[PDB]
């Protein structure tokens, strides 16, 4: 149960969604970009916290923040 907030500085480069190993992010239509897209995080209980989405965001001081919060059984990735 992390918190992946997306800010208005996205450019719809789509790179944050590809890096996510757990499919938390996905693109929705938007208008504040030439791409007309913005990241959204509908599945954040699945967020593992790897911040691999933040490494891919190219906007300077990146538009997507993982906010490591209450860690549960699927946000810590336990197979046992």
């Amino acid at each position: 149960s992390h918190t992946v907030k997306i800010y208005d500085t996205c450019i719809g480069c789509t790179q944050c969604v590809r890096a996510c190993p757990t499919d938390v992010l996905e693109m929705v239509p938007w208008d504040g970009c030439r791409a007309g897209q913005i990241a959204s995080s509908p599945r954040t209980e699945d967020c593992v916290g790897c911040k691999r989405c933040e490494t891919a965001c190219p906007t300077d001081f990146l538009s997507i923040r993982v906010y490591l919060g209450a860690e549960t059984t699927r946000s810590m990735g336990l197979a046992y």
């Binding site: 997306i6 499919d23 929705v28 239509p29 959204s40 995080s41």
Partner: protein, 139 residues
């Protein structure tokens, strides 16, 4: 529901543990045109079948690790399910039937802040309040 023939695999040690049938369990289901071999996300190698393939994995990251491997075999028709122990099977990937890199209509901006990240409020503003500085309904 879910069905398919399991790949040729001699069984591993990295597979399902007691969390599989007690909390919940995942299943990736894909169709292959060829009888080739893929790397198991739980260590090893298995031969994927000719028709409908079904594989049980402990956590969702393994399924999308394997799903990202299937795209290197030019297979993009996989579906990831989540099996609760009581038995019902949810469809979770791809959630709308199209892959999340693609943009649909009807999806909603969820956890979107309509401000730059730079003007999140100071922690003193939300002092002794339920919210954090990053929800912050201002702007």
């Amino acid at each position: 529901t879910l069905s398919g023939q399991t790949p040729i695999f001699g069984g591993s040690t990295g597979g399902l543990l007691k969390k599989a049938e007690v909390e919940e369990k995942y299943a990736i289901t894909w169709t292959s045109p060829k009888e080739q071999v893929f790397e198991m996300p739980t260590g090893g190698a298995a031969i994927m079948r000719q028709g409908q393939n079904l594989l049980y994995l402990a956590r969702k990251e393994q399924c999308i690790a394997l799903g990202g491997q299937l795209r290197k075999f030019k297979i993009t028709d996989y579906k990831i399910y989540r099996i609760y122990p009581n038995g019902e099977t949810v469809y979770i990937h791809p959630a709308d039937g199209v892959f999340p890199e693609k943009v649909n209509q009807g999806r909603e901006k969820v956890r979107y802040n309509d401000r730059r990240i730079g003007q999140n409020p100071s922690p003193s503003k939300v002092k002794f309040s339920g919210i954090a500085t990053y929800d912050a309904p201002n702007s």
